Amino acid sequence: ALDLGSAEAKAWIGVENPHRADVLTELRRSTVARVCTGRAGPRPRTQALLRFLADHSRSKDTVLKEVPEEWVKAQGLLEVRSEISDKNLYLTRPDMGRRLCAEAVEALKAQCVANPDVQVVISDGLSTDAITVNYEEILPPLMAGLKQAGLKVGTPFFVRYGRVKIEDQIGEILGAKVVILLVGERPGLGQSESLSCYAVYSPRMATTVEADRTCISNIHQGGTPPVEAAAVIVDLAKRMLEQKASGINMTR
Amino acid sequence: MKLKTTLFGNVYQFKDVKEVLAKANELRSGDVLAGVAAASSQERVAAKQVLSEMTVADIRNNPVIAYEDDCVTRLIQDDVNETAYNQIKNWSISELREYVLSDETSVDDIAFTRKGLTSEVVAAVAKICSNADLIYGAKKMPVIKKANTTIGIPGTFSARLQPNDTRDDVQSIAAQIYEGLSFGVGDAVIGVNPVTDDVENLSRVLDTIYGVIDKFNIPTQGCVLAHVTTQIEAIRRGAPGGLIFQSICGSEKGLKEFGVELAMLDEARAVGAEFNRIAGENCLYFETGQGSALSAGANFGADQVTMEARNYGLARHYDPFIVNTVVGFIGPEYLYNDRQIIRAGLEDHFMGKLSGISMGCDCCYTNHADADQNLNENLMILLATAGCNYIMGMPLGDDIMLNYQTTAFHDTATVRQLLNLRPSPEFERWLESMGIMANGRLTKRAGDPSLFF
Amino acid sequence: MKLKTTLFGNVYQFKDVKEVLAKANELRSGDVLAGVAAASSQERVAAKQVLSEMTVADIRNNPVIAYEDDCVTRLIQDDVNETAYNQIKNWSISELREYVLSDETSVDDIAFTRKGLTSEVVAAVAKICSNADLIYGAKKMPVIKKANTTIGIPGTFSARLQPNDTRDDVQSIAAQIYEGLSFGVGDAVIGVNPVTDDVENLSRVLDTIYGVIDKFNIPTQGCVLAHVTTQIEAIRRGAPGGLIFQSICGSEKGLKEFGVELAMLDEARAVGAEFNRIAGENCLYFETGQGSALSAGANFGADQVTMEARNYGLARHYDPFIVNTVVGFIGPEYLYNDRQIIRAGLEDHFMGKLSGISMGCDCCYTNHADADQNLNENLMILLATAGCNYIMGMPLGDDIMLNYQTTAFHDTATVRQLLNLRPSPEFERWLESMGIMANGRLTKRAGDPSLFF
Amino acid sequence: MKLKTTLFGNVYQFKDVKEVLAKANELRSGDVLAGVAAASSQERVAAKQVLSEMTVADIRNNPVIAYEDDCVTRLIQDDVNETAYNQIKNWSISELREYVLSDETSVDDIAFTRKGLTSEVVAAVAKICSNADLIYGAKKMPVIKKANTTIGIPGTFSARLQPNDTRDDVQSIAAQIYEGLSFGVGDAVIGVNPVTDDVENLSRVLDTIYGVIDKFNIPTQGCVLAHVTTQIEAIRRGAPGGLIFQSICGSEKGLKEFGVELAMLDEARAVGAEFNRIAGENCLYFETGQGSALSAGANFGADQVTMEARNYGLARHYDPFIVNTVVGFIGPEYLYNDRQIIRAGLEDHFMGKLSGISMGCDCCYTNHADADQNLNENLMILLATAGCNYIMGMPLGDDIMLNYQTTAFHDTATVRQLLNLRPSPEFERWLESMGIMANGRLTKRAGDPSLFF
Ligand code: B12
């Protein structure tokens, strides 16, 4: 009796007659990659295939799941959205996910502080878990960072159905010097809570290219811890303001 | 030229070459998203016929982005052998398809003929090929290159070891390397996408890859797939240089999105020549994939197949050791499902081989696309029959850090043993001496990374 | 007997073996239609695991239709080698899968092991196999038979010439035969589906097929795919007997629907032995396909994959020369799209080979299904790599009276030359002497039916 | 850095690396003429030992002409793989010699190692090699290139057809072409040295060569060996471009003497890429030979072997299809007799192959040298065993306008049949189809130019 989602299933060594089985356990411990599952001929072992299939079924669900409107409100966050109306359209229309809807633009000028030095934006993007699991761990220290020995912090808000390029429009509208997006990257097979930060100096819809952005990826408890990542993003923001540059245009 | 045909009594009119090229494509979500797709199957076939009736000259003289406007167009046009072009310029695309497919057309015939093509013409041929056409045509167009291994020899099949980690942890990277090598993966390259784009980290990751390479005297090459500028800096500072990598895009605007100047790729070759631990003459590594130009808003009304072909035209200029499309790396917005991902993989590979580059494929999909692992296994085998130079290998295909599913180490061994294909001969010798492979087949003791300990 | 598992903390319970077998299947429209499919991906995976942990004895002892109520179940069960069964009865389906796929398992190992199986067990193995598993598993299970040609030898690839006509017009039939032969199609059989099921017409069609066979001394065999009884009657009255055909279903109820009795297949065997122009020992030809039982109301709550496997248990009893699934012959209600049709084709072929029959596939689709010719070309190549014994051949694949698209004559020559496979050795010799083939490849003069005139 | 040794109790001191390089040479008339030769056999051996104990770094850091003063030195030095150099820089020339000759050193080992060398180091190795060393060393360093033929594959042996005429008479040129082809000569190139260096005449000669090539669909390439600039001009104005030729010298001063700029070889490469009828990637052709620098006053106190090696460092930069020394083209003042001409031929070829160029040899002598045809036959066979890529062919070896004796068409057929070597594979296929060759041997009907009429 084995639950394919259990720690025991995840730790299963499948190699048949191991040359050195203690090495195998040490190898299995050293990575989250699905090593040491062995084979049947050149094909995967059955248990390995079954767990792969189980993880995929759960992975598919994480792409479709949406954070309650109530949760966004409970974090004290302004919720705005892109031109996208639902999850299905989000997946097929990136061009609409890169643009605020008409009411979103007006809400930003109404409710957010004008001309900030550093603007923090949060969006579900392609993974809701990346936002929900990590939020309380990254957001407070980040805000407290940009304030403590810091400067004119913008007011944080949630964008539903957002794509990275939307931060350019957000930058122009609010007149922000630095725009920080915390967004869900596409779900992995066995992980869904991987968060990335896309940050850009003084963006412009008409001229800003992707290389102008600095990316911090793989933020989570299995990568770079949200707390530790927050201090990185603060220091990144300071550097952007000092150099008046982001992405490939930064030094070192 | 004609931009018009009559089909079942009804006239089908097109505005320009660009439109014909686009609407001739098999249906995909990216073409619909770009707004350039056919309205129906009828209009698609009409486009195919119009295209088939256009000459090489018609398509050559009408690149989707104009010469004076685009440095990729310029690079592609300027690389044309005008003598080879003059021979074929009045051929119809229908005739070019049949020429490529003919059993009386040799590898050497195509070697000269392809030099008279441009990427748009290469795309045009692909667009009027069936799936079997793409497979058979590609197979009779081998492209062979040499680093520390030889890749692309008919009867061989290579694989990139992709030992990625969420923190670039060297023990995790090493563990995956040992696992991959035990399945006979890594003759293409041992190549890591790093988390941090930084000289200390790049060196450390390279140090780890080459620690294994040097310990066991492995005929292969290492690579770290950070931006080309940081690889160059790392190598200049004394890090081991194997292959130098850059993702590319088929327009000037697309390259700007990626932060790439052509001068950087010139520099990459010069740095390789000065520093890199490579026996053969090829040392560059490019990756490509349909949808990238569209994402960058840099397709200029052109379909994603034509744009991908232009990647290969650009890549050909730098005579790389390896190129692969990353076929379903992005999402369903560009390729929605199994059918579309398979078709694109076959197209991409065929076009690469027609362009004369060392073309492989990352047979892959994402978890928000309408796809699963059986798709990867379908496509990997089809492309293998097509003479695909290489695929990826990860443990069970699960990328713990790039968040998608590629092919397993298992799958390379499966392909090889199914189709009686061998690794790169240099790598094969090493596998044999390690006791991992005998007569192309995994030994009993293979598939066990503890063998190295 | 466990009929339950916990997946992600959620308890999944199933009622019986049959429901486990049904829900373990990859998603297809037929299963949903039958009301037997999983309600979610998680339940499918839970069903797969539960099935994986069930033993050979669990599945063997619980056929989807009872022994006393069903003559096909009886035929299957009464054909079991009980010594072979006793060796494996306590193996899990998981272990059996790994056993079949192991490179340490020889063809001769599987030769004995398979005799201990029933069709339900064969189905169970296929249900927990990936696409590459199905392909590699099938490839290492060759099945070889002999009529006037030998089929199934690894490294070879055969094709049925299917020269069908709307009016059984002998000039149309002959035209397509000469066309098929010129591409090297016809080593499996020259087999016509007649529009009229009567003795005079059957004899006239056979006369036409054998007119060609005899004039050119072709090593092959003819067949007219009417009901068994009309074939027998025609042959007793002096018409040339080649292969004797019957479509089959995996239940007694389904056989009734078709109007066939097991006694008829007994008589066909004996009529073959007295009358038929066959050098080798095999002369029967069955066709099958997922959905037929469900259509007949004869699936008894069982999924179409398990029922299809039961066809092979039936067929194996009669040691036919050839069997092929007609994979997408019916419509989207049983197999909806590319993905499902490929999966079915791989399943059908694997299950056929595991059952020890000479298994081929009519790679095909209908015009009301979500499919096209590129699907046929995908599947034919994948199956060829799996060692599929034969596919169909028609001019461009267009059947003018059965109203569907199968594979072109072109497709067999493409497959052979792509994968370096040869025809049946006897037929290949004939092709070489006709100047149609050299070293496995179509000569310049091939592909031209006027060569015979 | 030791510049001294004790031999038989006698102290031998040399002034610098250059004098060590010069005096280590086997005796030849050119060195005595240059005033750089040893004064005795003992001093020669002392020079050899001193050289043997010098490191790669010692020689690399002391080129015979300074970096800032000489563009050839710069080209050579700037082409060094510094990672490869760093691995070997502390090796003695003795160790490098043993390394090159070792059976444990593979072709791929030498592939990387050679990138760490400069031409002076290449020369140093050759100076302490015996004749058998030079031959066996060269043989295990194959260099393979591709135009319309592949040259340099071990087990093959190519030949330039050299159909020269006193008046560039197109009927005389054609006669010698048909004669050469009938012996299987012409797989390296069909290359004419014209008497008049103008565009109209160049184009007419090319027309004649390509007239023959085109009528018989010959896999080869043509060349007219005028100055680079006239070749380019002719080709830009529409003359058929095959190989583009230039004679080279190992110093800037020497290039000036010849009237060549490096920029011209750059342009030749680009003109080849735009215009030339070449399937493969190599299209340049250089000729070299000991003595040219010394003649030009451009040896700067360096011996003719070291200067010759510098030619190969120059040539390697441009990755030519073919290079050959013209071993005894000039006169007895540089190479006096049989012995010296053989030694030079072996040196030149070894150094060429070590430098990684497609090295052949015009085995030849002049009538004012102490030599005869038996010398040509000695050297051609020795070099063939060394894996010399190609030699010349003329009717009986008599050049009627260059006034010297090279090898006969007979000599290539003799070499091939003696040593069981084949032509370039593409050319061999053509010869087989012409009925001129079977299994590597001249057929009865071969050797008869009227066969083409
Ligand atoms: C998908 C993807 C891509 C796609 C992006 C196209 C698209 N998605 O429409 C393609 C395949 C086109 C791509 C290309 C490259 N990528 Co990328 N990419 C990813 C990936 C796997 C997913 C990102 C994601 O999920 N974003 C979330 C969604 C919601 O955002 P989105 O709006 O839908 O997509 C945007 C971003 O993905 C952005 N983007 C994608 N990659 C990169 C890289 C950089 C440096 C930047 C600034 C932006 C960017 O492009 C889209 C803008 O419209 C990540 C890995 C990961 N686990 O996150 C790597 C990753 C972000 N990419 C990486 C790199 C280096 C590259 C390249 C520079 C490769 C190279 N060596 O040259 C190029 C150039 C990127 C550019 N400047 O445009 C690195 C970033 C390293 C860093 N810390 O700076 C990552 C982290 C992978 C890795 N190496 O570990 N990539």
Query: Do at least 3 CB pairs under 8 Å connect D with C?
Result: no
Instruction: Please tell me what DSSP assigns to residue B27.
Output: P
Q: Are D106 and D63 in contact (CB under 8 A)?
A: no
Rounded distance, CA B270 to CA A58, Å? Answer: 47
Query: What is the distance in A from the centroid of ligand 1 to the CA of D209?
Result: 56
Rounded distance, CA A118 to CA A176, Å? Answer: 6
Rounded distance, CA C72 to CA C310, Å? Answer: 8
Q: Which residues of C touch B374 (CB under 8 A)?
A: 26, 130-132, 339, 343
Identity at B118, one-letter amino acid code: T
Burial of D327 from C-beta contacts in 10 A (0-12 / 13-18 / 19+): buried
Query: Do at least 3 CB pairs under 8 Å connect B with A?
Result: yes
Does C306 share its domain with C428?
Answer: yes
Rounded distance, CA C393 to CA C183, Å? Answer: 9
Q: Does C267 touch chain A (CB under 8 A)?
A: no
Residue B153, both tokens? 């020899």
φ, ψ (nearest 5 deg) of residue A38 = 75, -155
Residue intervals in chain A for CATH 6.10.250.2060: 39-68
Contacts 24+ apart (CB under 8 A), D439-444: D440/D416, D441/D416, D441/D417, D442/D183, D442/D184, D442/D413, D442/D417
* Residue found under tokens 């596919």: C391
Determine the Cα angle at B271 with ends B266 and B276, to 5°: 130
Residue C194, both tokens? 């007649």
Q: Are C56 and C116 in contact (CB under 8 A)?
A: yes
* Residue found under tokens 């360096």: D302
Residue nearest to atom 23 of ligand 1 (CA): A185
* Residue found under tokens 């605020």: A100
Instruction: State which H helix or E strand residue D359 sits in.
Output: strand D359-362
**Which residues does B362 contact at the CB level (< 8 Å), separation at least 6?**
B287, B324, B325, B326, B327, B329, B391, B392, B406, B407
Burial of B239 from C-beta contacts in 10 A (0-12 / 13-18 / 19+): buried
Of C8, C9, C11, C41, the C-alpha closest to C23 is C41
Three-state secondary-structure class, residue D366: coil
Rounded distance, CA C116 to CA C77, Å? Answer: 10
Atom of ligand 1 nearest to the CA of B404: 21
Residue intervals in chain A for CATH 3.40.50.11240: 69-250
Three-state secondary-structure class, residue A129: helix
Q: Are C289 and C330 in contact (CB under 8 A)?
A: yes
What secondary structure, in 3-state letters, does chain C show? CCCEEEECCEEEECCCHHHHHHHCCCCCHHHHHHCCCCCCHHHHHHHHHHHHHCEHHHHHCCCCCCCCCCHHHHHHHCCCCHHHHHHHCCCEHHHHHHHHHCCCCCHHHHHHHHHHCCHHHHHHHHHCCCHHHHHHHHHCCCCCEECCCEECCCCECEEEECCCCCCCCHHHHHHHHHHHHHCCCCCCEEEECCCCCCHHHHHHHHHHHHHHHHHCCCCCCEEECCCHHHHHHHHHCCCCCCCEEEECCCCHHHHHHHCCCHHHHHHHHHHHHHHCCCCCCCCEEEEECCCHHHHCCCCCCCCHHHHHHHHHHHHHCCCCCEEEEECCCCCCCCCCEHHHHHHHHHHHHHHHHHCCCCEEEECCECCCCECCHHHHHHHHHHHHHCCCCEEEEEHHHEECCCCEECCEHHHHHHHHHHHCCECCHHHHHHHHHHCCEECCEECCCCCCHHHHC
Task: Characterise B439 by phi-psi region: left (phi > 0), alpha (psi -120 to 50), beta (else).
Answer: left
| Minimal Cβ distance to B108: which of D84, D276, D426 | D426
* Residue found under tokens 């494509």: B25
Rounded distance, CA C312 to CA C125, Å? Answer: 14
Does C50 share its domain with C61?
Answer: no
Residue C192 bridge partners (DSSP): C224
- Nearest-CA residue of chain D relative to B240? D83
For chain B, the residue count is 453
CA dihedral A30, A34, A38, A40 (to 10 degrees): 180
Rounded distance, CA D345 to CA D373, Å? Answer: 15
Residue intervals in chain A for CATH 6.10.140.690: 6-31
Do A126 and B368 make contact, defined as CB atoms within 8 angstroms?
A: yes
Q: Does C49 touch chain A (CB under 8 A)?
A: yes
CB A213 less than 6 A from any atom of ligand 1: yes
CB B244 less than 6 A from any atom of ligand 1: no
What is the edge-to-edge ordering of all strands in the sheet holding A157-160?
Answer: A78-81, A157-160, A118-123, A178-184, A195-201, A213-219
Identity at D432, one-letter amino acid code: E
Query: Which residue in B367, B402, B414, B434 has the most chain A C-beta atoms within 10 A of its own C-beta, making it the best mutation to test that interface?
Result: B367
Identity at B294, one-letter amino acid code: L
Q: Are A137 and A181 in contact (CB under 8 A)?
A: no
* Residue found under tokens 């982001």: A246
Q: Residue D168: give the domain boundaries.
A: 142-453
Does B184 share its domain with B324?
Answer: yes
Rounded distance, CA C66 to CA C46, Å? Answer: 26
Does D182 share its domain with D165?
Answer: yes
Rounded distance, CA C248 to CA C255, Å? Answer: 6
* Secondary structure (DSSP) of B364-424: -B-TTSB--HHHHHHHHHHHHHTT--EEEEBGGGEETTTTEE--BHHHHHHHHHHHT-B--
C-alpha distance from C154 to closest chain B C-alpha (Å): 11
CA dihedral C181, C185, C186, C190 (to 10 degrees): -80
Q: What is the CA radius of gyration of chain D?
A: 21
Q: Which CATH number fits domain A6-31: 3.40.50.300, 6.10.140.690, 2.60.40.10, 3.40.190.10?
A: 6.10.140.690
**Which residues does D289 contact at the CB level (< 8 Å), separation at least 6?**
D308, D325, D326, D327, D329, D330, D348
Query: Which residue in A6, A37, A39, A46 has the most chain C C-beta atoms within 10 A of its own C-beta, making it the best mutation to test that interface?
Result: A46
Does C311 share its domain with C383?
Answer: yes
Does C36 share its domain with C82?
Answer: no
φ, ψ (nearest 5 deg) of residue B306 = -60, -40
Q: Does B230 touch chain A (CB under 8 A)?
A: no
Measured over the CA atoms of residue C284, residue C287, residue C293 and residue C296, the dihedral's sign is negative
Burial of A17 from C-beta contacts in 10 A (0-12 / 13-18 / 19+): exposed
**Side-chain half-sphere exposure of A149, counting CA atoms within 13 A:** 5
**Which residues does C75 contact at the CB level (< 8 Å), separation at least 6?**
C262, C313, C314, C317
Does D47 share its domain with D85?
Answer: no
Q: Which of C12, C35, C54 is the last residue of a domain?
A: C54
CATH number at B68 reads 1.10.220.70
CB B227 less than 6 A from any atom of ligand 1: yes
C-alpha distance from D83 to closest chain B C-alpha (Å): 5
| Minimal Cβ distance to A46: which of C45, C94, C105 | C94
Rounded distance, CA B122 to CA B314, Å? Answer: 13
Q: Which of C108, C141, C174 is the last residue of a domain?
A: C141
Of D241, A230, A2, the C-alpha closest to C94 is A2
Identity at A142, one-letter amino acid code: L
Rounded distance, CA C109 to CA B354, Å? Answer: 45
Residue B443, both tokens? 């030994």
**Which residues does D271 contact at the CB level (< 8 Å), separation at least 6?**
D232, D235, D236, D241, D244
Do A186 and B366 make contact, defined as CB atoms within 8 angstroms?
A: yes
Identity at B259, one-letter amino acid code: G
Rounded distance, CA C346 to CA B160, Å? Answer: 28
Rounded distance, CA C14 to CA A44, Å? Answer: 26
Any chains having at least 3 CB pairs less than 8 A from chain A are B, C
Please, which residues 107-166 of chain C have a Cβ atom closer than 8 Å to chain A? Answer: 128, 130, 132-133, 136-137, 140
Rounded distance, CA A56 to CA A58, Å? Answer: 5
Does D127 share its domain with D155?
Answer: no
After which residues does chain C have a break in its backbone, defined as C to next N over 2.5 Å?
A: none
Name the H helices within B182-291. Answer: 199-215, 228-236, 252-258, 262-275
**Which residues does C112 contact at the CB level (< 8 Å), separation at least 6?**
C81, C84
Q: Are C280 and C426 in contact (CB under 8 A)?
A: no
Residue A245, both tokens? 């540059």
Question: Which of B198, B231, B247 gets mutated to test ligand 1 (max ligand atoms within 8 A of its CB)?
Answer: B247
Question: What is the distance of C-alpha D37 from the center of its chain?
Answer: 24
Burial of D103 from C-beta contacts in 10 A (0-12 / 13-18 / 19+): exposed
Q: Which of C91, C111, C141 is the last residue of a domain?
A: C141
Q: Which residues of C touch B139 (CB under 8 A)?
A: 418
| Minimal Cβ distance to B378: which of C131, C337, C441 | C131
Atom of ligand 1 nearest to the CA of A214: 47
Rounded distance, CA C2 to CA C17, Å? Answer: 10
Residue D167, both tokens? 């008046």
Please, which residues 385-444 of chain B have a Cβ atom closer than 8 Å to chain A? Answer: 394-396, 398-401, 403-405, 408, 410, 413-414, 416-417, 442, 444
| Minimal Cβ distance to C130: which of B135, B373, B382 | B373
Q: How far is CA B248 from CA A250, B281, B403, B405, D256, in A?
A: 22, 21, 21, 22, 43
**Which residues does A140 contact at the CB level (< 8 Å), separation at least 6?**
none
Q: Are A2 and C7 in contact (CB under 8 A)?
A: no
Does D107 share its domain with D211?
Answer: no
Determine the Cα angle at C202 with ends C198 and C206, to 5°: 175
Rounded distance, CA B278 to CA D4, Å? Answer: 37
Rounded distance, CA A21 to CA A18, Å? Answer: 5
CB B406 less than 6 A from any atom of ligand 1: no
Rounded distance, CA B95 to CA B107, Å? Answer: 17
Q: How far is CA A60 from CA A192, B135, B363, B384, in A?
A: 10, 31, 19, 28
Rounded distance, CA A229 to CA B150, Å? Answer: 43
Rounded distance, CA B198 to CA D88, Å? Answer: 30
Q: Are C224 and C194 in contact (CB under 8 A)?
A: yes
Does B62 share its domain with B179?
Answer: no
Three-state secondary-structure class, residue B336: coil
**Which residues does B152 contact at the CB level (< 8 Å), separation at least 6?**
B142, B143, B144, B145, B158, B358, B387, B389
For residue B431, the tally of other CB atoms under 10 A from its CB is 26
CB B166 less than 6 A from any atom of ligand 1: no
Q: At what angle do helices C41-53 and C93-101 cross, to 10 degrees?
A: 80
Do B279 and D80 make contact, defined as CB atoms within 8 angstroms?
A: no
Rounded distance, CA B176 to CA A34, Å? Answer: 9
Rounded distance, CA D344 to CA B74, Å? Answer: 48
Atom of ligand 1 nearest to the CA of A165: 53
The fold adopted by the segment(s) A69-250 is Rossmann fold (3.40.50)
CATH number at D8 reads 2.30.170.30
**Which residues does B217 contact at the CB level (< 8 Å), separation at least 6?**
B430
Task: Please give the class, per CATH, of domain A39-68.
Answer: special
**Side-chain half-sphere exposure of D67, counting CA atoms within 13 A:** 9
Q: Are C395 and C179 in contact (CB under 8 A)?
A: yes
Does D206 share its domain with D125?
Answer: no
Please, which residues 161-200 of chain A have a Cβ atom closer than 8 Å to chain B? Answer: 185-191, 194
Query: What is the distance in A from the centroid of ligand 1 to the CA of B188?
Result: 23
Determine the Cα angle at A168 with ends A165 and A171, to 5°: 145
- Nearest-CA residue of chain A relative to C105? A41
Does C338 share its domain with C453?
Answer: yes
| Minimal Cβ distance to A40: which of C45, C48, C102 | C102
Q: At what angle do helices C304-316 and C119-127 cross, to 10 degrees?
A: 140
Residue A83 is labelled as binding a ligand: no
Q: Does C103 touch chain B (CB under 8 A)?
A: yes
Q: Are D248 and D260 in contact (CB under 8 A)?
A: yes
Identity at B193, one-letter amino acid code: N
CATH number at D322 reads 3.20.20.70
Domain count, chain B: 3
Q: Are B371 and B358 in contact (CB under 8 A)?
A: no
Q: Are B52 and B42 in contact (CB under 8 A)?
A: no
Please, which residues 41-100 of chain A have a Cβ atom closer than 8 Å to chain B? Answer: 41-44, 48, 52, 56, 59-60, 62-63, 91-95
Q: Are D131 and D322 in contact (CB under 8 A)?
A: no
Q: How far is CA B358 from CA B146, B153, B249, in A?
A: 10, 10, 17
Q: How far is CA B409 from CA A39, B155, B412, in A?
A: 10, 19, 6
Residue C383, both tokens? 């199956």
